[PDB]
Design a protein around this ligand. Sequence first.
Ligand SMILES: *[C@@H]1O[C@H](CO)[C@@H](O[C@@H]2O[C@H](CO)[C@@H](O)[C@H](O)[C@H]2NC(C)=O)[C@H](O)[C@H]1NC(C)=O
Ligand SMILES: *[C@@H]1O[C@H](CO)[C@@H](O[C@@H]2O[C@H](CO)[C@@H](O)[C@H](O)[C@H]2NC(C)=O)[C@H](O)[C@H]1NC(C)=O
Ligand SMILES: *[C@@H]1O[C@H](CO)[C@@H](O)[C@H](O)[C@H]1NC(C)=O
Ligand SMILES: *[C@@H]1O[C@H](CO)[C@@H](O)[C@H](O)[C@H]1NC(C)=O
Length: 425
Amino acid sequence: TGLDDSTMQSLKSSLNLTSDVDWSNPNPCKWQSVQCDGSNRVTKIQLKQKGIRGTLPTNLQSLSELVILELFLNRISGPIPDLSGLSRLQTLNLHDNLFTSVPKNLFSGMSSLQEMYLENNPFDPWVIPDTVKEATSLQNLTLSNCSIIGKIPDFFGSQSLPSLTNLKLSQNGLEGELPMSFAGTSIQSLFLNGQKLNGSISVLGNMTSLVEVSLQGNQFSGPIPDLSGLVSLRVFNVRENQLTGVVPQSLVSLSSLTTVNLTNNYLQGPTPLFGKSVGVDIVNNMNSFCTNVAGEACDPRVDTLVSVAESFGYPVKLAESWKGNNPCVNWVGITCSGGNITVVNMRKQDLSGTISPSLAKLTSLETINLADNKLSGHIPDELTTLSKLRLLDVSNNDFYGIPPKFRDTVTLVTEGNANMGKNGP
Ligand SMILES: *[C@@H]1O[C@H](CO)[C@@H](O[C@@H]2O[C@H](CO)[C@@H](O)[C@H](O)[C@H]2NC(C)=O)[C@H](O)[C@H]1NC(C)=O
Ligand SMILES: *[C@@H]1O[C@H](CO)[C@@H](O[C@@H]2O[C@H](CO)[C@@H](O)[C@H](O)[C@H]2NC(C)=O)[C@H](O)[C@H]1NC(C)=O
Ligand SMILES: *[C@@H]1O[C@H](CO)[C@@H](O)[C@H](O)[C@H]1NC(C)=O
Ligand SMILES: *[C@@H]1O[C@H](CO)[C@@H](O)[C@H](O)[C@H]1NC(C)=O
């Protein structure tokens, strides 16, 4: 009476059905919580929260017309079998079982899949396979707490997964950087909290459909990008990272914003002042803001030095040290003669970037040593206005252009800059 009958017997044998599930009929299309279409092919199997033990039969993918498979909150163990024959499957919900592995070709063949929830299964550790690019209808993917390792694959772009909306990969063991193909996507919910992701979060600024993002508890560094395109952003949680730099005004000014968690980073400049409808999680002293008063301006020397750090790319080493509103109190590389900043010394600090023209606003400076780094660009002419400057040593970088003329009394060391004096087109 049906092409799926024999595979359904395999399923009935491999599951220890609880007792209020009646699968006794000779016709599996009449089984409880099983649905068939007009041609007697199985289209839905929905055994929700029954605590059922057993396994999945390895011929499950023979149910080629299966559309809905919901078995979450049971105690089903063993491997998840090959699912590539389930080309009409729209929903796969297996969360909170006892499955111990996923097929290595997961997503292959699954051209109708809209949503997949596997979270909280004790899987053997696995990398998200590149066959995820075959699940071109995917909208919801929750693989949180699934023992995933490796990197986020670069297959979440729009010409692969144009419908992807809710990507939840919380509490795995992912590492590495955010994929570039996140740029231009229409992901609306991104949960990557609680693992080992690192690098820059600038790609967020090209994710203009984002409504909710949590990067909480990773190793992201660098500044928060320009977010002025994220006109629907409501929840922004980047708690417990290594973010540095000034909180951009484009984030503080988003009218859609509802909730912001910045606690436990190395953010610099003034504590930001969000709108008063915003729930704000910024606990005193758990960043590197100049004061703990939201909206309070910094000391102008602090503003100047943060601009200097900006052109170094906001290194974590400076942000961890440059705390409070007085640069004369134990800031690394900063020496003062009673209130006046007199020395900026960052020799051999692996610095990349340029020298900010703002450095010339520290008008009491007597020595600048930036030797033995990886800086480039021009030496700013504004430095020649430093009337008390006696030594500018930029040895062993990659500066170019015309070296400015300092007064007779300034010692300028530019040796080791191969392209110094080169100023052609
Ligand atoms: C994809 O995930 C979203 C959750 O972000 C689902 O939308 C929610 O569904 C629940 C049902 O459990 C409703 O109570 C919520 O009101 C929905 N929230 C919305 C619509 O913003 C959605 O159903 C999932 N599936 C698909 C196919 O999109
Ligand atoms: C992110 O910050 C928000 C805002 O401070 C936190 O939301 C608060 O959570 C507790 C729970 O009762 C209460 O202080 C308030 O009810 C919430 N305020 C709101 C919703 O505006 C939220 O807990 C933080 N998230 C994390 C993961 O730490
Ligand atoms: C994560 O999954 C494991 C099973 O591997 C489970 O014991 C644990 O409760 C899950 N954690 C959460 C927060 O659900
Ligand atoms: C980020 O993590 C990867 C993988 O562990 C590592 O190879 C890379 O050097 C890290 N990058 C940064 C900037 O920390």
